[PDB]
Amino acid sequence: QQTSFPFRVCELSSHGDLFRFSSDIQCPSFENHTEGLLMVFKDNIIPYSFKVRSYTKIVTNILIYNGHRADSVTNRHEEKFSVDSYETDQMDTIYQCYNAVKMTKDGLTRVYVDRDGVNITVNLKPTGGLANGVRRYASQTELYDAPGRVEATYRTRTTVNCLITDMMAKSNSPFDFFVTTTGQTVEMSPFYDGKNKETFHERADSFHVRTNYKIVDYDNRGTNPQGERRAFLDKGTYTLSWKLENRTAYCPLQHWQTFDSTIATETGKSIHFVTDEGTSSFVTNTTVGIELPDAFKCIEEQVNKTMHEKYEAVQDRYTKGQEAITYFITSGGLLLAWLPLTPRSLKSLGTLNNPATVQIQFAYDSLRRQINRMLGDLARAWCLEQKRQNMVLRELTKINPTTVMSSIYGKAVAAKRLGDVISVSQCVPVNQATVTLRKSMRMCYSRPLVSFSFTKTYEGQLGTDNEIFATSQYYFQSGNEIHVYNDYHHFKTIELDGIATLQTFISLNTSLIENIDFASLELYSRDEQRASNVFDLEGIFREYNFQAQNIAGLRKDLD
Amino acid sequence: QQTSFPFRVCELSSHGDLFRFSSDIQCPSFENHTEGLLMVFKDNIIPYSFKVRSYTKIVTNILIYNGHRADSVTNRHEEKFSVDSYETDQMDTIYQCYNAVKMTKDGLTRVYVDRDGVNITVNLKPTGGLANGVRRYASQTELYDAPGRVEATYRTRTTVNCLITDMMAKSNSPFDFFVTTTGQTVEMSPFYDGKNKETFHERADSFHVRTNYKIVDYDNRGTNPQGERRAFLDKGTYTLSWKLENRTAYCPLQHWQTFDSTIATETGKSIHFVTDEGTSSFVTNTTVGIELPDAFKCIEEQVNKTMHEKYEAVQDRYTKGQEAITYFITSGGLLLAWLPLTPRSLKSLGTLNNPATVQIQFAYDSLRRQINRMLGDLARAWCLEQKRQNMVLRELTKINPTTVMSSIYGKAVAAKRLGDVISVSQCVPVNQATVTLRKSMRMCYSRPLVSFSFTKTYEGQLGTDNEIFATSQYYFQSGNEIHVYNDYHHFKTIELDGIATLQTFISLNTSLIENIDFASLELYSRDEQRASNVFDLEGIFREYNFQAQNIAGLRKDLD
Amino acid sequence: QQTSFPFRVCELSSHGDLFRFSSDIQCPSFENHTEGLLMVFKDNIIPYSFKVRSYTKIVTNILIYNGHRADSVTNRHEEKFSVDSYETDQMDTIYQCYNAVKMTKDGLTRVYVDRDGVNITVNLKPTGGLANGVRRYASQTELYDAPGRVEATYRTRTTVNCLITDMMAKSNSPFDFFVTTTGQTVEMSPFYDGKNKETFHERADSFHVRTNYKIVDYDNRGTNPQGERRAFLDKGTYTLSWKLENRTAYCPLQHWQTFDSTIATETGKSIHFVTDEGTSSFVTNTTVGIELPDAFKCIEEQVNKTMHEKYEAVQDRYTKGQEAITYFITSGGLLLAWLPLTPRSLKSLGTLNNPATVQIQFAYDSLRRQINRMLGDLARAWCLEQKRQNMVLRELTKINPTTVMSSIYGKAVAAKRLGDVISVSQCVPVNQATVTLRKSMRMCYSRPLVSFSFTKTYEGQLGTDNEIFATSQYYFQSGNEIHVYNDYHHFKTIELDGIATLQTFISLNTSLIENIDFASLELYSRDEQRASNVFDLEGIFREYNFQAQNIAGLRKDLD
Ligand SMILES: *[C@@H]1O[C@H](CO)[C@@H](O)[C@H](O)[C@H]1NC(C)=O
Ligand SMILES: *[C@@H]1O[C@H](CO)[C@@H](O)[C@H](O)[C@H]1NC(C)=O
Ligand SMILES: *[C@@H]1O[C@H](CO)[C@@H](O)[C@H](O)[C@H]1NC(C)=O
Ligand SMILES: *[C@@H]1O[C@H](CO)[C@@H](O)[C@H](O)[C@H]1NC(C)=O
Ligand SMILES: *[C@@H]1O[C@H](CO)[C@@H](O)[C@H](O)[C@H]1NC(C)=O
Ligand SMILES: *[C@@H]1O[C@H](CO)[C@@H](O)[C@H](O)[C@H]1NC(C)=O
Ligand SMILES: *[C@@H]1O[C@H](CO)[C@@H](O)[C@H](O)[C@H]1NC(C)=O
Ligand SMILES: *[C@@H]1O[C@H](CO)[C@@H](O)[C@H](O)[C@H]1NC(C)=O
Ligand SMILES: *[C@@H]1O[C@H](CO)[C@@H](O)[C@H](O)[C@H]1NC(C)=O
């Protein structure tokens, strides 16, 4: 950086060395982006959801006592049975069933019938229900509970009701079971039939499927509809049916975002798909490795309907680069569908839930493209400055080659100029101890005389930089101080720091980037999320169970 | 960039063209921020929550058998009835009720009384309960179950218990229903009365509201309290009451963050509200468009209490810019309240849950302000460099106008100097084929002679850059090589690449910004979140339902 | 910036002032990072989870009617009792129990036995269950329900079943209670014994612990196993046991990430732990303040096993800086374990759930290190440019000190050169009103004559910049226009803007950073999260409760 010029004696070039001025500067200089159509999908988390019908006969017995002043109902007992096919299907079409219910236990037969009367046919009429909840049809909305006519006696009254409920059920992959709106569980895939690989944990022979099945809504009661494939299941206390869709009904991933104009920018490791609209950028570990998906075929349709709309609605300035679409997988588990456009002449994928990554990736990807393009101009514009700083030197040498030389080099040197060529040598510094100045200057010497040694003495003349070889006021430099000379005769000697020094240095007051400790914030804490339900799962159960145990303590004493 | 100087003959200016040196450089140069008080609110997600009282008489009958060696309890049957107003209100004030229960079914009357005895008045005393759960008062904590006195006979014992439960209920907007701690559901708004637009799906006449109602805590039993408006609801197996608040009780959005010093910075599209403390920045699509909210009036109070504290606690160096506060909506669904300060003389808003956006927006907004301010200094400081690079040229021309000229231009040119003005022309290049050098230099020529053509021949002298018009050692340039001249006589000819070339070019070894593939990370996965509950909703139900179906299979044989 | 040179008369230096050229430039110049092993932990949110065994005898009575044509089952009543120790432990070892059940109510004894027969010993054999759910052993999988033999009569049949269930329970800190797979709740810590500070809300004497207890799996029935400490609890309708672990079994925080090579970089406020692999950076409010944790001792083991592997697998180029490990807490509630390596010779912590912070912190921390290192080169490289722009001036003064001087200063000045020293003065501007040029130039004057005042007149010669003291064509500058002089005689007068002006200014076409409004996006909304469960908590309850209230309305008429 900084450079000492000892008092150097330099009346010596033995054509040391020589360099030329490059007739001209040789300016050293210092990414490939294809527009395309981006479309990203994510893992889908909404469980597969479908309509289910359930059927069931409810049998209630009330024990009713006929006292002398009033009556007491002393017990009520309600049991719910399944419904056989012969009558599931009067229910599905005409909406009639029987008011009776049969079974066999150890060979003996048990039977229940409405009002302890006879087994007849009845209609299921609609009943009321929740704003927007399951819909039911029942056959006896009245409970049979009339005191026998003899005072001081118990009579037991039977009532039977056929109940159909329409509601929906949900199942999650890999489809081991499903659950109906009202809380019922079924241990099997909604997609299972005889012989399917689909999962099945129910009785082997409580399941069966009907073909060209005729279900009708209560409002097309007695209409002949199209016919469908229906599953039927017996669960002891009810029967369940639903329509038998293939497993293709359900789709693993779902469409997240679709990006009109996006630039795919290639690198070593990966490819960055930056989109300006989504203000985000998807990176994939691919290096050109375009895939084709297998068990995600569920997407083809929409994936290629949308590409068609995009393409067509921009079709004029652009042509297709790949004839087909290709597939990429994000590190965060997103799935990219992409086809690039060139100009015309002039199982699960395991999505992480961190939407921030792709936008950070975009801040930084963006501030990169912008800093780097301004750095390129620093280059060009700065290169021009050198191209002329060069020439200028070529000139300045012609004045005095030496200084100009020392300067560029960065050390005490000396040189002569031999035409189109400059010849630099090296100097050898004289005694810093013995270096002495002389008073006189006698025509006159524009430069003072001085004498010095190395072991005997010599006599010489002072150059600028402390080099050595009417009304007259001049000033001169020496080792660590200046000299005042009136009329070619010495006057006084001021120090290097006495005479004011002029700075010419354009300050580049560029200040550097701060540290900033980024604050940790959240929109919603966990408690806030927990407290966000109306159903106190814990409250409702813990008190339920507490009360329960209290009544159970009544069954006995506690010493 | 790079520039060929053919061997050009240029003893010709027909006062081609002339330019002056701008007596001085004309330096081209290259946002408005108002401090204010920021305060952001979010969508609130904690459901509206209030105290509820429920009331109910429980009737149990036990069937108790008196055997000869021991007794068996063969049935237990428990039914829960609502409570009429005449007695809801002994309960609320004195805490007494009846041990009896009446009703009419098909004109006939049924009645139950404790211990099958007489209808009297009883006290409800406090019972035990969960650490911190619902509080109850009961009237018969004992169950009546004593064998009749005759051996080998069934007797049926009635016990009745009045039960009050204090607990809380929760309701979510738009308030279609609510649910009490213990799991009970009510199909209506907690804010509904006769004639209100509030939602109501219960029986029209099971609901009613009391005015100046007197409820007292068991500990101010028999105190005359203030009186309040209370809802009363009959749900068949219980009555429910709660205090009748207006719907203003509940608030859609809640206070998130409040920011002491924040700078609002305006743009084309939007306004950026950057805060240094929150280390974040809220952007709004407004362009000055300050709003005033309508159904969020719930905020006014706190919003303007806090502004008052802020203002006052900084009131001296600052004055109010708007006299009122104004309202803004973030793209991420936050709601900004803001009033700017100037110095003194010297339905839902749909919050997204992505806390990252505003901090990314702030990283980049920040690195922008910082890069751009350092780029401004590059400007000023670099402009100074040109201001002096200018002057320097004005000088250097005076030495030899030509080179200095070619240089700035970027092509072979030639010029004379006419006082304060320079006159540039254009040259015409001679034969590159026929260009020949001469041996002699005989006073002497400081420049060698050479002859050349265009079709006949001419004879001339070599200029620097290959232009054309005692102990003597000099060196000279020619097309693609140098010439050694001893004593004004040619010696040898070395090539352009034989003699070492000196570089003067300050290297600007600025390296550009890396690519960095940002990693995809999460703090907590989904499984981790799912596994985070103690209640296995699925476990508790699926086994519940399995067991259930097992007992149901016992009702019959299975061939 | 811009500078007026009035027509200034400057034949006056009274050795005004003088400055020297710093023999050389004095170049002003403009963070400490230690590699180490990072390892971060988070708050753990998976509740403590352990195996539980429950035991219980179920007593059912069926009321079975024997009609003349068929039989009716008119009631069923099932009660569940706990199991005493004398027989809990036949169950745990041999898997036999009694088919009978006893109790005392008000001194009187009640008893139930299977099939209303005699009290014997029975085996509990395995039963079936859910794919992968709780496992049970039962003793009577058959229900006793056989019509008495007399026509038109009720008989009541008793059946008793002993049931053991193996399942698991979960408890959350601070461990106030726990819940078993099937929905049962227990009001106490799973870690409680006599005298422990652990929490206990059950009966004081229903709890007890066995020592060297012998439980065996049904498959090592009658094997003598090791023996263990077991809790036993009576809950009225069942007994529960589990193994009695210490509370150390459970750990508050869990291991999140572990980082091979990471650089810890110190600042004023904080320390930044940046890791290149995790592409993230953890900041801590510490300032060297290394902690040691207290109730997180659960980590020591793994924390220091992993440090050992890391260390050893890089042990050669690195040595340990601290002999022990030290502990830090992130602002986002992460807990850093860290030990730094130097080269060899050549309660809860409250984790926030915002994974984005540490990566933003890293984008910006990174773009800082990179911008700042390129800014350092701007410095060095730009400093060199000044170092030579300096020297060049030292030269150019020797041509004409004045202009060179005015230039560097930035105002009209004038100077002479006194050897190694330059002496600057100040000038005094003459009349802008009265400033007049003369026609002649008669040997000749290379500069025209002009006369001017201040109040009387004077006569003088024009300098460059408007200063004042055969075939001849020259051109000259004056106040706001130029002058054409043919043969030392005036010709015409063109304006400052008539003659074309040459620009030499290297354009630094650096453009500044854009604003970018960052888009607000989420991967999964709330509805999407809510809709993601199969169990409609609300559906299953609201319809449950609706139906319930419907049957309750049957108990009476409604005028
Ligand atoms: C009721 O009658 C129908 C028609 O004969 C028959 O299929 C059904 O089994 C009968 N049910 C009972 C309970 O006897
Ligand atoms: C399921 O398979 C059957 C027969 O192969 C077909 O008729 C039905 O439409 C399929 N479902 C779909 C939508 O592919
Ligand atoms: C001037 O430059 C230095 C380093 O180059 C820096 O420390 C300082 O902050 C700068 N000042 C301003 C106001 O930019
Ligand atoms: C019990 O007595 C009170 C007081 O006369 C009365 O209001 C109530 O209806 C009676 N209840 C029954 C169950 O008879
Ligand atoms: C609700 O309205 C009533 C009467 O207009 C009023 O007395 C009551 O205080 C209101 N609630 C509030 C807090 O505005
Ligand atoms: C030197 O500069 C070039 C381009 O200007 C760049 O490729 C290289 O990385 C730089 N070297 C260093 C060490 O900064
Ligand atoms: C059944 O017998 C065993 C063995 O004597 C005894 O411990 C138990 O109390 C008896 N149980 C009943 C219900 O009598
Ligand atoms: C719990 O404490 C007991 C006795 O002090 C000990 O035997 C047992 O192993 C402890 N548990 C652990 C794993 O520290
Ligand atoms: C040229 O520079 C100016 C300011 O220095 C800027 O406004 C403009 O965008 C630049 N042009 C380009 C193409 O970089």
Q: Look up the CATH number of the domain holding residue A523.
A: 6.10.250.3280
Residue partners of A69: CB distance under 8 A and separation at least 6: B111
DSSP string of A306-346? HHHHHHHTTTTSEEESSSS-EEEEBTTS-EEEEEEEEEPP-
- Assess whether B419 and B448 both reside in one domain: no
* Number of domains chain A contains: 5
Interatomic CA distance for residues A209 and A232, integer angstroms: 6
Give the residue on B whose Cα is nearest the Cα of C73: B555
How close is the Cα of C233 to the center of ligand 7, in Å? Answer: 21
Output the six-digit token pair for A471.
Answer: 């009304």
- The pairs formed by B187-190 with CB atoms below 8 angstroms and a separation of 24 or more are B187/A130, B187/A131, B187/C542, B187/C546, B190/B48, B190/B50, B190/B231, B190/B242, B190/B245
* Interchain CB distance below 8 Å, C357 and A518: yes
What is the 3 state secondary structure string of C192-241? CCCCCCCCECCCCCCEEEEEEECCCCHHHCCCCCCCEEEEEEECCCCEEE
C367 lines ligand 7 (CB under 6 A): no
- Assess whether B55 and B37 both reside in one domain: no
For residues B200, B202, B206 and B211, what is the CA-based torsion angle, rounded to 10 degrees?
Answer: -20
Query: Which chains would you list as touching A if contact means 3+ CB atom pairs under 8 Å?
Result: B, C
Burial class (CB in 10 A: 0-12, 13-18, 19+), B429: middle
- Are B333 and A334 contacting, i.e. CB atoms less than 8 angstroms apart? no
Render the burial of A289-319: b for 16+ CB within 10 Å, e for the rest.
Answer: eeeebeebebbeebbeeebeebeeeeeeebe
Residue partners of A243: CB distance under 8 A and separation at least 6: A50, A51, A228, A229, A230, A231
- Assess whether C490 and C357 both reside in one domain: no
Looking at residue A43, the DSSP 8-state letter turns out to be: E
Interatomic CA distance for residues B337 and C464, integer angstroms: 64
The enclosing domain of C453 has a CATH number of: 2.30.30.1230
In what helix (H) or strand (E) does residue C363 lie, and over which residues does it extend? Answer: helix C356-397
Residue of B110, B119, B160 to test ligand 4 pocket, by largest number of atoms within 8 Å of CB: B119
Please tell me whether residue C420 adopts helix, strand or coil conformation.
coil
Is the bond preceding residue C47 a cis peptide, omega within 30 degrees? Answer: no
Nearest atom in ligand 9 to the alpha carbon of residue B30 is 4
* Interchain CB distance below 8 Å, C356 and B352: no
* The residue to which tokens 């904690």 are assigned: B46
* Interchain CB distance below 8 Å, A555 and B73: yes
Task: Enumerate residues 99 to 118 of chain C having a beta carbon within 8 A of any beta carbon in chain A.
Answer: 103-107
* Interchain CB distance below 8 Å, B388 and C389: yes
- Assess whether A527 and A537 both reside in one domain: yes
Burial class (CB in 10 A: 0-12, 13-18, 19+), C472: exposed
Range of the domain at C483: 1-10+427-496
Looking at residue C345, the DSSP 8-state letter turns out to be: P
C248 lines ligand 8 (CB under 6 A): yes
How close is the Cα of C503 to the center of ligand 9, in Å? Answer: 18
- Are C80 and C238 contacting, i.e. CB atoms less than 8 angstroms apart? yes
Hey, CA dihedral for A85, A91, A97, A103, is it positive or negative? Answer: positive
Maximum Cα–Cα distance across chain C: 163
Interatomic CA distance for residues A332 and A341, integer angstroms: 26
Nearest atom in ligand 1 to the alpha carbon of residue A111 is 13
Output the six-digit token pair for B14.
Answer: 């027909």
B224 lines ligand 6 (CB under 6 A): no
In what helix (H) or strand (E) does residue B281 lie, and over which residues does it extend? Answer: strand B280-284
- Are A556 and C105 contacting, i.e. CB atoms less than 8 angstroms apart? yes
Interatomic CA distance for residues B366 and A513, integer angstroms: 10
Candidate from A18, A361, A386 with C-beta closest to B505? A386
Where is the domain boundary, C481, C496, C511? Answer: C496
Nearest CA to ligand 3 atom 8: A511
* Interchain CB distance below 8 Å, A420 and B477: yes
Q: Please count the residues of chain A.
A: 559
Instruction: Compute the nearest-CA separation of B352 from chain A (Å).
Output: 9
Of the ligands numbered here, which is closest to the C-alpha atom of C245? Answer: 8
Q: Which of A30, A12, A27, A83 is nearest to A53 (CA)?
A: A83
Interatomic CA distance for residues A369 and A365, integer angstroms: 7
Give the residue on A whose Cα is nearest the Cα of B509: A379
Which residues are near ligand 5 (CB < 6 Å)? B 246, 248
How close is the Cα of B250 to the center of ligand 5, in Å? Answer: 13
What are φ and ψ of residue C487, in 5° steps?
40, 60
* Interchain CB distance below 8 Å, B553 and A236: yes
Nearest CA to ligand 6 atom 1: B509
Task: Enumerate residues 223 to 282 of chain A having a beta carbon within 8 A of any beta carbon in chain B.
Answer: 235-237, 267-270, 272
Give the residue on A whose Cα is nearest the Cα of C534: A170
Output the six-digit token pair for C272.
Answer: 């930044």
**Looking at B176-251, which runs of residues are DSSP E strands?**
178-180, 185-186, 207-213, 228-234, 239-243
Of the ligands numbered here, which is closest to the C-alpha atom of A514? Answer: 3
- Assess whether B297 and B208 both reside in one domain: no
How close is the Cα of C246 to the center of ligand 8, in Å? Answer: 6
Candidate from C365, C390, C420 with C-beta closest to A475? C420
Looking at residue B20, the DSSP 8-state letter turns out to be: B
- Assess whether C416 and C554 both reside in one domain: no
How close is the Cα of C376 to the center of ligand 3, in Å? Answer: 12
Residue C296 pairs in a beta bridge with none
The enclosing domain of B354 has a CATH number of: 1.20.5.1890
Q: Which of B99, B114, B208, B218 is nearest to B159 (CA)?
A: B114
Nearest CA to ligand 3 atom 2: A509
Please tell me whether residue C473 adopts helix, strand or coil conformation.
strand
CB contacts < 8 Å between A and B, how many? 304
- Assess whether C523 and C389 both reside in one domain: no
**Looking at C487-553, which runs of residues are DSSP E strands?**
489-495
- Are B249 and B48 contacting, i.e. CB atoms less than 8 angstroms apart? yes
Give the residue on A whose Cα is nearest the Cα of C22: A501
Residue partners of A448: CB distance under 8 A and separation at least 6: A437, A438, A441, A461, A462, A476, A483, A485
- Assess whether B274 and B378 both reside in one domain: no
* Chain C residues touching residue B355 (CB < 8 angstroms): 354, 356
Query: Which chains would you list as touching C if contact means 3+ CB atom pairs under 8 Å?
Result: A, B
Output the six-digit token pair for B256.
Answer: 């998130």
- Are B114 and B144 contacting, i.e. CB atoms less than 8 angstroms apart? yes
Hey, CA dihedral for A409, A411, A417, A421, is it positive or negative? Answer: negative
For residues A107, A113, A118 and A124, what is the CA-based torsion angle, rounded to 10 degrees?
Answer: -130
Of the ligands numbered here, which is closest to the C-alpha atom of C99? Answer: 7
* Interchain CB distance below 8 Å, B537 and A537: yes
Output the six-digit token pair for B264.
Answer: 């609002």
Interatomic CA distance for residues A314 and C393, integer angstroms: 61
Residue partners of B3: CB distance under 8 A and separation at least 6: A24, B406, B410, B411, B412
- Are B505 and B48 contacting, i.e. CB atoms less than 8 angstroms apart? no
- Assess whether B299 and B435 both reside in one domain: no
B535 lines ligand 9 (CB under 6 A): no
DSSP string of C171-182? E-TT-S-EEETT
Interatomic CA distance for residues C332 and A546, integer angstroms: 39
Render the burial of A328-354: b for 16+ CB within 10 Å, e for the rest.
Answer: bbbbbbbbbbbbbbeeeeeeebebbbb
* Chain A residues touching residue B403 (CB < 8 angstroms): 391, 394-395
* Interchain CB distance below 8 Å, C109 and B24: no
- The structure's method of determination equals X-ray
Please tell me whether residue B152 adopts helix, strand or coil conformation.
coil
Where is the domain boundary, C346, C380, C409? Answer: C346
* The residue to which tokens 């193994």 are assigned: C243
A40 lines ligand 1 (CB under 6 A): no
Instruction: Compute the nearest-CA separation of A149 from chain B (Å).
Output: 12
Burial class (CB in 10 A: 0-12, 13-18, 19+), C314: middle
Residue of B209, B246, B247, B300 to test ligand 5 pocket, by largest number of atoms within 8 Å of CB: B246
- Assess whether B271 and B314 both reside in one domain: yes
Nearest CA to ligand 8 atom 7: C246
Interatomic CA distance for residues A173 and A252, integer angstroms: 8
Where is the domain boundary, C208, C230, C250? Answer: C250
**For C189, what's the count of Cα atoms within 13 Å in the CB-facing half-sphere?**
19
Candidate from B112, B134, B407 with C-beta closest to A388? B407
Interatomic CA distance for residues B273 and A10, integer angstroms: 68
Interatomic CA distance for residues B272 and C515, integer angstroms: 10
Candidate from A74, A236, A508 with C-beta closest to B77? A74
Task: Enumerate residues 373 to 432 of chain C having a beta carbon within 8 A of any beta carbon in chain B.
Answer: 373-375, 377-378, 381, 384-385, 388-389, 392, 396, 399-400, 403-404, 407-408
* Interchain CB distance below 8 Å, B542 and A388: no
- Assess whether B150 and B212 both reside in one domain: yes
CB contacts < 8 Å between B and C, how many? 304
Q: How many CB atoms lie within 10 A of CB A76?
A: 19
Output the six-digit token pair for C3.
Answer: 């500078």
Instruction: Compute the nearest-CA separation of A436 from chain B (Å).
Output: 34
- Assess whether C341 and C366 both reside in one domain: no
Burial class (CB in 10 A: 0-12, 13-18, 19+), B143: middle
